[PDB]
Ligand binder design. Structure first.
Ligand SMILES: [Zn+2]
Lengths: 189, 140, 138, 141, 65, 56, 54, 98, 70
RNA sequence: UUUGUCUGGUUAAUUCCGAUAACGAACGAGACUCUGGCAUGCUAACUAGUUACGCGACCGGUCGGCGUAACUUCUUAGAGGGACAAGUGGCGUUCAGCCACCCGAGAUUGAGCAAUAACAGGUCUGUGAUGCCCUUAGAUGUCCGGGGCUGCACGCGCGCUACACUGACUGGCUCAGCGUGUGCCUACCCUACGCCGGCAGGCGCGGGUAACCCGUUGAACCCCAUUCGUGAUGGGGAUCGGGGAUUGCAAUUAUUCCCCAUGAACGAGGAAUUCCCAGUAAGUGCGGGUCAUAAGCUUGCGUUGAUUAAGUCCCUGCCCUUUGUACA
């Protein structure tokens, strides 16, 4: 009965996509007590996918240079943000992270061609691991930039960002940029 | 925690507008000659709890702040805190506050400009005073 | 009676494990008294994973030195797990050791197997191992 | 059970020993405890004016854990990080005046003696006075 | 890249032309064979020679090289 | 008295100055190098040369 | 000249109080462990002292 | 209680002379406690290569190791002269105190 | 930002009659909709736990979490 | 003069396989030395530790608290062992190898070394290495003294510090590691502990030529509570005044430090561009250098420790093959 943070069951949450079924690692083998693993995971191609999704989530919040290297600060932030999910919405938060990452990866994208500086772009589609990590990057942007200059602190902003990609409101910078960088691939066609 | 009827939205004491919406030892920092390291021992020796805002205090303890503030040496603010510890002209131990630090500053500047010593000539010409390189830095 | 180490880094933990009525003490403080508490489950991971019945005969005293704080935590949990497995191989039968090693390894391999990564040296011409200075052209 | 300092949580125990070193009234308070900065790197005086009792509480806890220490090692324990302005930051040592006056004031109430090696240690009476306070935080949950 | 250089695959073949009655298919036997049958300086060359005579005995007994 | 490190360094400076001075005098002798061997009855300094008759 | 002002300056505590023990220069010295050579005379005699690149 | 202290810059001559000294003292069977390996001090001096400072700023790294050992034995202190007459190999030097 | 330094007369019925009907009560919750400083948020929302209409869910030096007691 | 040295596959590599008028080789690469990762197997030890004891101190537990007998797990460091694309599946002209996965400490650890031969590359300011020219006593030798390299309508580059709420300020808590230490020339040192000050410091007894003393190197960041509440604000601490101490023959053109005061742009920076692939970038401190005083630089050490790629010749350089010459 491996429970995340002591309190979260991993047994029940619903990945409703087939394409990210082996690429969101949350189910029973990847049930861990903590979002810290101190792992060796990015040492090969495709061992970084079956890092747990919570561990990738707290590492992608380490991003800017004032907060480089500091992991337990983001373990604390993700702990209070998950408690903010359980208090504001009251559903299992692992469905909120799974719904945010499944819903917010952009399914089509654009590539630059044109011999390096005349802009004619071409639309192709996205690999699912690129969709997962693009979704975590568009979810960690938003929330830090929307709690950069505010009276709102970060934990409510990040948990509301995962909520706002879990239900698909278009105040969500993950969902807003998802629609924008898929619609320019719609436009360059 | 509700505003009292004795709450002040401003103070204008010693002719600087002290805002009534800030905390007291950080409300008093506009007077040149009190900063915070002077301020917290001022409110230590004036026997006021620090927790209150600027409007929450009555006028009697506030005038105890100003009256003990002008001569702190009567009330054991000790001797190494002092702003001018040996004056050039008076030779007394003093802590000089808003409008008197300015007058003593420009008199010491103009005394340096009178007697042909180095530092006021460096002050008058437009240079850095204390030995700095101005070849690359300080351009206006 | 065993004493068997675990290390992650220049942090080095060794647990002193002999027969008793149950104990865990890391340098004289027990396992519920270590300073980082966002990492509280890492030291408790054999206690939550194996259960307190699997520790039911031993007195484990852990002595640590060196490293940082988190490397010290990761040496504490590895030294505790190696302490119980070394006691179990010497004094209990080896199928219990087989059961405890597949329940410990398959969760996380740093509980039984060390970390060979150490900090690589600075070389000249830059402030780290790989990074280099800014190299103006004109 | 038997409750020593090493078995209990160290965030409440130093404040309860500070409550005893306030409530006895036999720790002397010198004349300048209310206007001082506590090393050359800190900016301000303490928020709470009860810093002297808290500092003496932690000092006797540090003499509980490791004796054979002096003032010059008490400043090595109590250093910190100096912000230096536009220069890089530095590590700069703690004050010997506060450690000298705290350790003589803890010798004043017959709680603290010197070591045979010239530095400091606990008495049996000062050992007793800290294990009882560990016994009294041990019931408060 | 783990390509074997000239000495570890010429010296292994001149080790295999003679002394074929001692060599075999297991690496740890041939590694111990290689110090009676040669004078090799230090062991990383000797482990590389032993790895190529194990790969060559893996190749050679099902046809001509 | 003196350290182990400063003893080893100062004896190395003794080897350096002895070989440099013996090269700067003895061009004709076939000078190639010197050999120190120290026992406390007598400290022995052995010169390598191919022609001894100009060494004497 | 006069022997009360000629070389009367203190040649304690100076950059002119120390020099290379081989080549009489004072710049870029190696002061550690009692070498007192400048860096070039370190690099000539380096293996002759026993300091070996490894 | 006489302790002989060996020091060198190379390990192999020091290992031969320490083996020879303990073989000469184990053939006569005095009480000898074994070689106690004290930690090596690396003297490192990192100088710049270029004599005028013009190139691409490559740096040079020299080092020298000092290997420090001892043997300690309980004996009459004039029996101890006869063991230190076989130990006169270059490199290693012998310091004797009681 | 122009915030209250202490409570106005009709701020107490807002503090007592809107806020325990809110889903999440943090010190970042009240100050956006009240134009108050966060010091009023920390002191006043700490004082309501002695009025017993909230439950403390988490406490940290940066982030404090309260809610409705059903 | 050419082939050998290549159409191709493969490699980090003229590394190899293969084709084949070439066959066998040498230098460079690789091998090699040093370091990192493993050992309950050996050797082991008052300048290193574990533990069973014996006693003291405190309410079985705690004790780096005081001293003894067995061991070498933790410390030190030698002698050998060990990882080889070796085992398996697939791809592959079934050949070089490449990819995947178990068993395993480890399935590209990092640095030194560095060929043919050349540049009008830098250095005559490292040289009692120097060739010639120069000056050589109203010196360009050589000393003593004030001054200078520090100057500023102004550019360009290396860097540091920040533009804050993951923060700032105050208290508590707990952990490293490379190493330095009393000197031919020659005054120049690491500092325990006790007393006096709020600091730099003053004063004295001690220890140390080093695994012994500083030193369990009680390091910073990180962690846990207090306050602050988006304001050019309690961030920014630039510039600027009086005072105290240290060094030194001497601090003015403030060397350094501390006390108090003062609060400038700066709110995340445009065209161009720099650096980087696992303990890596980055955040953060501690040693070495220079040093009578000493680091916004350099050289190392550790600590907290990730996103992203597992490829291409579009760009920028470079090598090679074919090709053109009136260029050598
Ligand atoms: Zn040199």
């Amino acid at each position: 009965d491996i429970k995340l943070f002591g309190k979260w069951s991993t047994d029940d949450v619903q990945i409703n996509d087939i394409s990210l079924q082996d690429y969101i690692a949350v189910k029973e083998k990847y049930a861990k007590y903590l979002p810290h693993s101190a792992g060796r995971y990015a040492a090969k191609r495709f061992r970084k996918a079956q890092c747990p999704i919570v561990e990738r989530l707290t590492n992608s919040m380490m991003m800017h240079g004032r907060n480089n290297g500091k992991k337990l600060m983001t373990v604390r932030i993700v702990k209070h943000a998950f408690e903010i999910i359980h208090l504001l919405t009251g559903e299992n938060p692992l469905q909120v992270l799974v719904n945010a990452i499944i819903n917010s990866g952009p399914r089509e994208d654009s590539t630059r061609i044109g011999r390096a500086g005349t802009v004619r772009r071409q639309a192709v589609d996205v690999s699912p691991l690129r969709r997962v990590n693009q979704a975590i990057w568009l979810l960690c942007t938003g929330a830090r930039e929307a709690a950069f200059r505010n009276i709102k602190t970060i934990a409510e902003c990040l948990a509301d960002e995962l909520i706002n990609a879990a239900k698909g409101s278009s105040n969500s910078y993950a969902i807003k940029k998802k629609d924008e960088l898929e619609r320019v691939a719609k436009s360059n066609r | 925690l509700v505003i009292p009827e004795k709450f002040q939205h401003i103070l204008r004491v010693l002719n600087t507008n002290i805002d009534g919406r800030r905390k007291i030892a950080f409300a008093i920092t506009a007077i040149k000659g009190v900063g915070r390291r002077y301020a917290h021992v001022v409110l230590r020796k004036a026997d006021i709890d620090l927790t209150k805002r600027a409007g929450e205090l009555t006028e009697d303890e506030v005038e105890r702040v100003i009256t003990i503030m002008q001569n702190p040496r009567q009330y054991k603010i000790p001797d190494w805190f002092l702003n001018r510890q040996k004056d050039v002209k008076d030779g007394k131990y003093s802590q000089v506050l808003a409008n008197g630090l300015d007058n003593k500053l420009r008199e010491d500047l103009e005394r340096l400009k009178k007697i042909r010593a180095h530092r006021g000539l460096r002050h008058f010409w437009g240079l850095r005073v204390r030995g700095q390189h101005t070849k690359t830095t300080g351009r206006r | 009676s065993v004493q068997v180490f675990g290390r992650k880094k220049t942090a080095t933990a060794v647990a002193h494990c002999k027969r008793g009525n149950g104990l865990i003490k890391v340098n004289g403080r027990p396992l519920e008294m270590i300073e980082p508490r966002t990492l509280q489950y890492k030291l408790l991971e054999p206690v939550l994973l194996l259960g307190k019945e699997r520790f039911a005969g031993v007195d484990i005293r852990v002595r640590v030195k060196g490293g940082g704080h988190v490397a010290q935590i990761y040496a504490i949990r590895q030294s505790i797990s190696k302490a119980l497995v070394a006691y179990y191989q010497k004094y209990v039968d080896e199928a219990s050791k087989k059961e405890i090693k597949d329940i410990l390894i398959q969760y996380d391999r740093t509980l039984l197997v060390a970390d060979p990564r150490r900090c690589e040296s600075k070389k000249f011409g830059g402030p780290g191992a790989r990074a280099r200075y800014q190299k103006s052209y004109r | 059970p038997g409750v020593t300092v090493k078995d209990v949580n160290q965030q409440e125990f130093v404040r309860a020993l500070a409550a005893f070193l306030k409530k006895s009234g036999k720790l002397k308070v010198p004349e300048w405890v209310d206007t001082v900065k506590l090393a050359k790197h800190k900016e301000l005086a303490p928020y709470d004016e009860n810093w002297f009792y808290t500092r003496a509480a932690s000092t006797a806890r540090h003499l509980y854990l490791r004796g054979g220490a002096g003032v010059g090692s008490m400043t090595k324990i109590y250093g910190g990080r100096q912000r230096n302005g536009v220069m890089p930051s530095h590590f700069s040592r703690g004050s010997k005046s506060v450690a000298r006056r705290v350790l003589q004031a803890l010798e004043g109430l017959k709680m603290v003696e010197k070591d045979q090696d010239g530095g400091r240690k606990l008495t049996p009476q000062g050992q007793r006075d800290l294990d009882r306070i560990a016994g009294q935080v041990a019931a408060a949950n | 890249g783990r390509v074997r250089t000239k000495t570890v695959k010429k010296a292994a073949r001149v080790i295999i032309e003679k002394y074929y009655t001692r060599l075999g298919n297991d690496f740890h036997t041939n590694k111990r064979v290689c110090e009676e049958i040669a004078i090799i300086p230090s062991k990383k060359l000797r482990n590389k020679i032993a790895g190529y005579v194990t790969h060559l005995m893996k190749r050679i007994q099902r046809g001509p090289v | 008295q003196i350290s182990k490190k400063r003893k080893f360094v100062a004896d190395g400076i003794f080897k350096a100055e002895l070989n440099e001075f013996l090269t700067r005098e003895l061009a004709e002798d076939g000078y190639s190098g010197v050999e120190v061997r120290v026992t406390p009855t007598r400290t022995e300094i052995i010169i390598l040369a191919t022609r001894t008759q100009n060494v004497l | 000249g006069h022997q009360q002002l000629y070389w009367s300056h203190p040649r304690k505590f100076g950059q002119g109080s120390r020099s290379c023990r081989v080549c009489s220069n004072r710049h870029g010295l190696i002061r550690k462990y009692g070498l007192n050579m400048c860096r070039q005379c370190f690099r000539q005699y380096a293996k002759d002292i026993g300091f070996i690149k490894l | 209680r006489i302790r002989i202290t060996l020091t060198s810059r190379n390990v192999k001559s020091l290992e031969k002379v320490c083996a020879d000294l303990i073989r000469g003292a184990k053939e006569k069977n005095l009480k000898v406690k074994g070689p106690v390996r004290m930690p090596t001090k690396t003297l490192r001096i990192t100088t710049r290569k270029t004599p005028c400072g013009e190139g691409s700023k490559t740096w040079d790294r020299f080092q020298m190791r000092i290997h420090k050992r001892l043997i300690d034995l309980h004996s009459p202190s004039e029996i101890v002269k006869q063991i230190t007459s076989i130990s006169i190999e270059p490199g290693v030097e012998v310091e004797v105190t009681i | 930002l122009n915030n209250l330094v202490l409570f106005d007369k009709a701020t107490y019925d807002k503090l007592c009659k809107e806020v325990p009907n809110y889903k999440l009560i943090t010190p970042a919750v009240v100050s956006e909709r009240l134009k108050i400083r966060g010091s009023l948020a920390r002191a006043a929302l700490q004082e309501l736990l002695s009025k017993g209409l909230i439950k403390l869910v988490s406490k940290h030096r940066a982030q404090v979490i309260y809610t409705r007691n059903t």
